[PDB]
Design a protein around this ligand. Structure first.
Ligand code: FAD
Ligand code: FAD
Ligand code: AUJ
Ligand code: AUJ
Ligand code: AUJ
Ligand code: A1AU7
Ligand code: A1AU7
Ligand code: MG
Ligand code: MG
Ligand code: MG
Lengths: 582, 582, 287
C-alpha cells in the first residue's frame, strides 16, 4: 500500500505527479540527462527518496543503459531526455529495443503545448519520428492524463511482446499544479481485447502427439523463452529433444549441457544447423525465423513439421508457415505440455537417443575451433579463459561484430539474462552502456563488457559514468585495430580490398591506436594491456580481482574470421567451415 | 566537361553509378562509416580518385562533420551511413541541419528491396523516421533512378531555403549492373514552379521609401544573409542603419564595426534589444523571428513598421506580421535597393546620426561586462584573448550552453562562415565534429572548437579522427565541471537546487574530472591545462603555434552566468543585467 | 497567370488565415485578421480624416463605366428557344432579387452567378472550390429548413440534378417549399463547351439523353417529380417562360419547372485556364 509524499488533496506540479507515477510502478532507477525542457522532471526526481538517477554522458548512453538494466533483470528500463537533441539522441536505443522486444519506457521533455508546431527552440516532432520504431508512444496534452498514460506505457512496454514506449511531456504540463487521480482506468480496449489467452489442451495434446510420432526432433529456442528457463528445462528432460538456440535465446537452456546444440544460424555450429536441416519435427519456441537464422527459407527445415509457439500472432506464419501454431505465452505452453508428458509418460515411451547420437557424431566431427599462432592471443581463447575464471557466472554485454559472435560461441551461459547483446538492429556502442545498466540492476554480479575497439570507442564517454557511479564494470576489450566483421566480408567477397575498415593510425601503422588505456586513465579506471597469450590468464584474473571498474586491452591478430559462416541467403550446403584473412 | 572512369556503354554497379553521380556534383569530401548495407558504396568510393572519405568514429560524428563542412564553406556536406543503427545515428544531425537551414545530402544503405518491411537484419524504416526532420527524402527503388535522385537531392539541399535531404539505397540496387543516363530531367515540377522570382522594383522602391520616412531604423539580420556579406555592407553604408544580428547571422555584418549593435535576443546586448524595442522601421533580412529572439511577440518591435525579406514564403508572417514583405533572395533585394539608394542619393539625403547617437549612449551605458575574481580565468576573457591572438580570423565552432553564448559575445567575426554553431536544435556534441568538417573544407584556416566539458565529452571519440586525418584542429575547452547553462537556470529559478548538473566526481570533489588531457593523449594530440589567468595568453599562443591539432583545458569558475538575459517569453522591461551563482 | 494578375498594383491582402497570406501572390501590405474588424477600423479613420483625404476616384470609375458600357454581359435569343440567361433574369425579376439561390456545377452555375442580382450575402449557395455536382437540390433543402419563410430556388442542370434526384422524396416528406428551376440542355454542358473550344467539338460522353430517341427530352424530369408528389411542368417556348416561372412561384410548396434550352450556348466571357486578360474570349458558341 503506497505512501505518497503529498497530501491526497494537495496540488503538486505535473513533474511531481510523473515521478510519483514512476514510484507507484516500482521504479528504483532511471537514466536521465537534464535539459531545459526536462528541468522540472529533474527537480521532481531529486525529491524522490526511492528513485536513483544514473546520469550518463550522452543520451544514447542513457537509453543503452536502460536497455542493459532491462535485459539483465526482466524489469523495464527507464530513460529520460530533454526535448530536441536530447530526444533525437535516444532514437537508436528505441529502434534497438523494438527489434529485440526489450521493455523500455522513454520519457522526453517537450516544448510547451502552445509552442508545438511553431519550429520552437529545441523542438522536434519526436512522436512522429519514433512512431515506427516504438511499440507505442504518447504526447501528453493535459496534466490530468499523466497518471493514466504512465500506467498505460508501463503496461504496454512489459505485457505481450515487450518493447519500447515513449511519452512526450510538454514543459508547461510539467509545471501545472494538479491533484492526481490514481484510480483512472486504462484506455486500451483493443489491445487488452487481443491479449492471447492461456493455451487450450486441444493444441497442447496435438503437439505432444507430434513429438511421439517423430524420429528427429529439434528445439529451436529464442528470446521468447528468457522467462521459461525452468519450464524449458523440465520439458527437455521429459523428452530429451536436443536444443538449438538463437543469438537472443542464449542461456535459456544451459550452454554447457549434453543436450545443447548451441547456436544456429549464419554463424551457428555445424551440428546445430545440421539438426535443423535434417529434422522432421521443429519446435520453434519464442523465435521469429530471422534471416540470420534461416537463410533461404525454402531450404530452412525443409522436411520438418514446424510447431511455432509465439505470443505475437503477427509473427506466426510470417516468414515460414508452421504446421501447428499456438499464439500464447511459451511459459504456459511448456507448463501444459509438461503435465501431459509426465502423465502419459508410459504410453509415450519417448526415446530419441538414436537421433541424439547422429548429432553427437556431427558435434564431434565439427566442433567450434580456433588456431593459435605463436604467442598471439586468440580472441576465442580469451573469452574461454574469462568463462573459466568467472565460472560461467558473469553477466556479459557486447558490442557488435566478430567479438560478439565469439562472446556468443565461447562463453557458456547457464541462465537467461546473462547475455546482453544487440541482435536485431545490431547497434555498435551498445556494450559499455549496457554493462552500466546491468551492473546497477545487479550490484553483486560480475559484469563484463566483451567489446571491440570500434564499438568501444563509439560510447567511450560512458567511462566517466562508470567511475562516478562507482560501478564494478569490467571491460574485456578485444582489440584488432579493425572493423573486423566488415573486414571479414571484405576478405570473402571483395578480394580483401580495404574500404575504411582500419581503425588505427596509418602514419604510425604498427602502434596500437588509440591507446584505450589512456581513455581509462582519464576517468580514473585502472587498466592494463596484454599481448602475449602467456600473460592472458593472469591479466584477466587481475581484472576480476581488482575491486571496482577495470579495463583490459587484449591485442589480437586481425586476420581471424568468425566461423562457420552460411553466406547471406544460403543453405546448409553452402556453409563455409575454413579460412581467414591470411 | 566531365570524364567518367567507365565507357559510356559499359555497365557498372549501382554503387559506382552513385559515386560518379557525386563526382558529377563536384563532391570532393564525404564522411562515411562503413557497414554491411553500404559496403558496396565504400568499395565504389575507393575507386574514385577525386572523392576523399574522412572516416569518423561515430556516425553522429560523421553527420556533424558534414554540417561543419557545409556551414564553413557554402557547399553541401555529404555523410554516408549503413542501414539500421548506422542510419539512426544520423538523426540528430538531420534535425539539426533542417532547423538551421544547412545544406546536407545524407546517403544510407538499406536492406535489399525484397526484404523491406520484413523486420530484416539491421532494417529500420529510415524514410519514415526522418520524413519530418528532413527537407525531403527518397527510397531508391530502381538502379535507373540513381542519377536522377542524386541530382534532385543536391538541387533540393542547396536551392531555396537550404536543408538536409536523405537518400536510402537498398543493397541490391548498389550491386545491380547498369548504364547510367545522365541526361534524365528532374521531376520537381511543383517545387521548381514555386521557386521565388527576382524581386520587383515595385516592392524594392516601397522599402527605400519607408527608410527615408523613418527616424529610428534597425537592421535585423540572420542566417539568410550569409551569402550577402558584400551587398549588406554596401546597403549599410548607403543608409547608415545600425545592424543587429541573430546567433546564426554572426559575421554577416562585421562584429567589430561602429554601426554594429551585435547580437539581439534572450542573450543579446542591452543596446541591440533597445534599438529594436524603440525602432520605427525594422528591416528583418534573412531571419525567422525565433522565440529566443523575440520573447513575447506582442512586445517585440511593438512600434515598428516591419519589413520581412525571406526566401521561404512559409516564414513570412508566421510569428510576426510584417507591414511590407518580399519573398525572395535577400542578396537580390539588397542589390536592387543598393541601386535605388545610390541613384536617388540626393533626393533622399539619409542621415540617422541622431538615432545612431541615442544607441551609442546605450552602447556606452550597458556594454557586455565580466568580473575577474583573483587569479581565476574568466571564460569571456579567454575567448577575447583567442580573438586577439588569431586577429579575428579563426573559424569558430562550438558546443551548446554558456560557452556558446560567450563565443558569440566575445569574438569578433569579420566574415560569414567563421561561426559554426547549432542554433535551432541546440545539439551538444556538435563542436568537435563540426571543426573536423570545417578544417577539411578550409585546410589553411585556423580552426578552433570553443567547447564545454559536457558537450566535448559527448563526441570525444572524434579525437581519433582528428589525429588520423592529421587535421590542425585546436580545442579551446572551457571547463567548469558543470552543465553550466542548466546550472544557471537552476540558480535563477530553482533556488540553486542541483539536479544532475555536476559533471565531475563527487568522491574526489575538487579534482578536475575527467582529465581531458588524457583523452587527448590517448589519440596522440598534444595538450595542456591552464588555471591561472597569468598563464592564459602564453597557453593559447602555444596552442596556436604548435603545428597540428591541440587541446587546451581552460579551467573556469562555474558560478558565471551568461548575461544579459531576457527570461523566456519576456519583454525588454524584464531584462536581467546583473548576478551570478555566488 | 499569376505574374500577369494585377501586374501593376500595390496589393493589400486582409485574410483571417495567415497561411493564405502571400501563398500565391505576394502582397505589399498584409493584415492577418477578421476583415470585419479591419473594415470597422478603416471606416473610423476614413470618416474622421475625411477632409484631409478628399477622396475622389470618379475619373477611374469613369474609365471603367466605359468598359462596363462597351462590354456588358450579353446573350443571343434564337427564334422561340428559351435562353438560359433570360430565364434566370426573369426569375430575378419575379422574385425581386430576394430568393435564396443554390445551384449545381457547370454552365447553369455561371449563369446563375452572372444573371441574378444578389442583394445580401447568404443568398448564393454554390460549390466553388471542389465544384461538386449534385449540390443544388440538397443545398436548397438545408437552406429552406434554415429559412422557412424564404423563396428557395435550386437553379440546376440536368446532369447535376439527376445525381441526387432521390432528395425529392425528402423535399416532399418534409413539406419544404423548394422550387427547382431546372435548366435542361440534355448535355454535360460545361465539358461540352470545352470540347467545342479545344477538341474540335468531338463528343466524349457528354450527351445525357437517349441516343435511340435522340430528339426526346430524356429522362423526363417531370415524372421524377411526380413519383414524389411534387407539382411540375415543362416549358419550351420563350413566350411561356414568364407565366411558367410565375406559376412555380405562386404554387404553395415544392415545385419543379423543366426549362428546355439550346445546348450550343457557351458561358462567356472566358479567359482560358492560365491565361492573361489579353487572351479573354468574348464571342462564340457551339454553332
Ligand atoms: C553480426 C550478427 C550476426 C548474427 N548472426 C546470427 C546467427 O548466426 N544466429 C542467430 O540466432 N542470430 C544471429 N543474429 C541475431 C539476429 O539478427 C536476430 O536478432 C536473432 O536471430 C533473432 O532472435 P529470435 O529469433 O530469438 O527472436 P527475438 O528478437 O528474440 O523475438 C522473440 C520472439 O518471441 C516472441 N516472444 C516473446 N515473448 C514470448 C513469450 N513469453 N512466449 C512466446 N513467445 C514470445 C516475440 O513475439 C518474438 O517473435 C546476428 C546478429 C548480428 C549483429
Ligand atoms: C542556448 C541558446 C541560446 C540562444 N539564444 C539566442 C539569442 O539570445 N539570440 C539569437 O539570435 N539566437 C539565439 N539562439 C539561437 C536560436 O534558437 C535560433 O537559432 C536563432 O535565433 C534563429 O536564427 P535566424 O533568425 O537567423 O533564422 P535561421 O535559422 O538562420 O533561418 C534563416 C532564415 O532566412 C531565410 N533565408 C535563407 N536564405 C535566404 C536568402 N538567400 N534570402 C532570404 N532569406 C533567406 C530562411 O528561410 C529562414 O527564415 C540561441 C540558441 C541556443 C542554443
Ligand atoms: C552503429 C553502427 N555502425 C556500423 C555498423 C556495421 N557493422 C557491423 C555489422 C555486423 O552490423 O555489419 O553491418 S559489425 C561492424 C564492425 C565492428 O567493429 P568492432 O567492434 O571494433 O570490431 P569487431 O572486430 O567486428 O568485433 C560494423 C562497422 C553497426 N553494426 N553499428
Ligand atoms: C545533446 C543535448 N543534450 C542536452 C541538452 C540541453 N542543454 C542545454 C540547453 C541550453 O539547450 O538547454 O536545454 S546547454 C546544456 C549544458 C551545457 O554543457 P557544457 O557544454 O559542458 O557546459 P556549458 O558551461 O553550458 O558551456 C544542456 C544540458 C542539449 N542542448 N543537447
Ligand atoms: C460530381 C462531379 N462529377 C464531374 C464533374 C465535372 N464537371 C464540371 C466542371 C465544371 O467541374 O469541369 O470539371 S461541370 C460538368 C457538367 C455539368 O452538368 P450539368 O449540370 O447538367 O450541365 P451544365 O449545362 O454545365 O449546367 C461536369 C461533368 C463535377 N464538377 N462534379
Ligand atoms: C537558453 O535557453 C534556455 C536554456 C535553459 C536551460 N532553459 C530554457 N527554458 C525555456 O526556454 N523554457 S520555455 O519558456 O517553456 C520554452 C519557450 C519556447 C520554446 C521552448 C521552451 O522550452 C524548451 C526550450 C529548452 F528548454 N531555455
Ligand atoms: C553478420 O551479417 C552481415 C555482416 C556483414 C558485414 N554484411 C552482411 N551483409 C548482408 O547480410 N547482405 S544481404 O544479403 O543483402 C541482407 C540480407 C538480409 C537482410 C539484410 C541484408 O543486408 C543488410 C544487412 C547488413 F549488411 N551481413
Ligand atoms: Mg575490432
Ligand atoms: Mg561546462
Ligand atoms: Mg445540362
Amino acid at each position: 500500500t503506497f505512501i505518497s509524499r503529498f497530501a491526497p488533496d494537495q496540488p503538486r506540479k505535473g513533474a511531481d505527479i510523473l515521478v510519483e507515477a514512476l514510484e507507484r510502478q516500482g521504479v528504483e532507477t532511471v537514466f536521465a540527462y537534464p535539459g531545459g525542457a526536462s528541468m522540472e522532471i529533474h527537480q521532481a526526481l531529486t525529491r524522490s527518496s526511492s528513485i536513483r538517477n544514473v546520469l550518463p554522458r550522452h543520451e544514447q548512453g542513457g537509453v543503452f543503459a536502460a536497455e542493459g538494466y532491462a535485459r539483465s533483470s526482466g524489469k523495464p528500463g527507464i530513460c529520460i531526455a530533454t526535448s530536441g537533441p536530447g530526444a533525437t539522441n535516444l532514437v537508436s536505443g528505441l529502434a534497438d529495443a523494438l527489434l529485440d522486444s526489450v521493455p523500455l519506457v522513454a520519457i522526453t521533455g517537450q516544448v510547451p503545448r502552445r509552442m508545438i508546431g511553431t519550429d520552437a527552440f529545441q523542438e522536434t516532432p519526436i512522436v512522429e519520428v519514433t512512431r515506427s520504431i516504438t511499440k507505442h508512444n504518447y504526447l501528453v496534452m493535459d496534466v490530468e492524463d499523466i497518471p493514466r498514460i504512465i500506467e498505460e506505457a508501463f503496461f504496454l512496454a512489459t505485457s505481450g511482446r515487450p518493447g519500447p514506449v515513449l511519452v512526450d511531456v510538454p514543459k508547461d504540463i510539467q509545471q501545472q499544479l494538479a491533484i492526481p487521480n490514481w484510480e483512472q482506468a486504462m484506455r486500451l480496449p483493443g489491445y487488452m481485447s487481443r491479449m492471447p489467452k492461456p493455451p487450450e489442451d486441444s493444441h497442447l495434446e496435438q503437439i505432444v502427439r507430434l513429438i511421439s510420432e517423430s524420429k528427429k526432433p529439434v528445439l529451436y529456442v529464442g528470446g521468447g523463452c528468457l522467462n521459461s528457463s525452468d519450464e524449458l528445462g523440465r520439458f527437455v528432460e521429459l523428452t530429451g529433444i536436443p536444443v538449438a538456440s538463437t543469438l537472443m535465446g542464449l542461456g535459456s537452456y544451459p550452454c554447457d549441457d549434453e543436450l545443447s546444440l548451441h547456436m544456429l544460424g549464419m554463424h551457428g555450429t555445424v551440428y546445430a544447423n545440421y539438426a535443423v536441416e535434417h529434422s522432421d519435427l521443429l519446435l520453434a519456441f519464442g523465435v521469429r525465423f530471422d534471416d540470420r537464422v534461416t537463410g533461404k527459407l525454402e531450404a530452412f527445415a525443409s522436411r520438418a513439421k514446424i510447431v511455432h509457439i509465439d505470443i505475437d500472432s503477427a509473427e506466426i506464419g510470417k516468414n515460414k508457415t508452421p504446421h501447428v501454431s499456438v499464439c500464447g505465452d511459451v511459459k504456459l505452453a511448456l507448463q501444459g505440455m509438461n503435465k501431459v508428458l509426465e502423465n502419459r509418460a508410459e504410453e509415450l515411451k519417448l526415446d530419441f537417443g538414436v537421433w541424439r547420437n547422429e548429432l553427437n557424431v556431427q558435434k564431434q566431427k565439427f566442433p567450434l575451433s580456433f588456431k593459435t599462432f605463436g604467442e598471439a592471443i586468440p580472441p576465442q581463447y580469451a573469452i574461454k579463459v574469462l568463462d573459466e575464471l568467472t565460472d560461467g557466472k558473469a553477466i556479459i554485454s557486447t558490442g557488435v561484430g566478430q567479438h560478439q559472435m565469439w562472446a556468443a560461441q565461447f562463453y557458456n551461459y547457464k541462465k537467461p539474462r546473462q547475455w546482453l547483446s544487440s541482435g536485431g538492429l545490431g547497434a555498435m556502442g551498445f556494450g559499455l552502456p549496457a554493462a552500466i545498466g546491468a551492473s546497477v540492476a545487479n550490484p553483486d554480479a560480475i559484469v563484463v563488457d566483451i567489446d571491440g575497439d570500434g564499438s568501444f570507442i563509439m560510447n567511450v564517454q560512458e567511462l566517466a559514468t562508470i567511475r562516478v557511479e562507482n560501478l564494478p564494470v569490467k571491460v574485456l576489450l578485444l582489440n584488432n585495430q579493425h572493423l573486423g566483421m566488415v573486414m571479414q566480408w571484405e576478405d570473402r567477397f571483395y578480394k580483401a580490398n580495404r574500404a575504411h575498415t582500419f581503425l588505427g593510425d596509418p602514419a604510425q601503422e604498427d602502434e596500437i591506436f588509440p591507446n584505450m588505456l589512456l581513455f581509462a586513465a582519464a576517468c580514473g579506471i585502472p587498466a592494463a594491456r596484454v599481448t602475449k597469450k602467456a600473460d592472458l590468464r593472469e591479466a584477466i584474473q587481475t581484472m576480476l580481482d581488482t575491486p571496482g571498474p577495470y579495463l583490459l586491452d587484449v591485442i589480437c591478430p586481425h586476420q581471424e574470421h568468425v566461423l562457420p559462416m552460411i553466406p547471406s541467403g544460403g543453405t546448409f550446403n553452402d556453409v563455409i567451415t575454413e579460412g581467414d584473412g591470411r
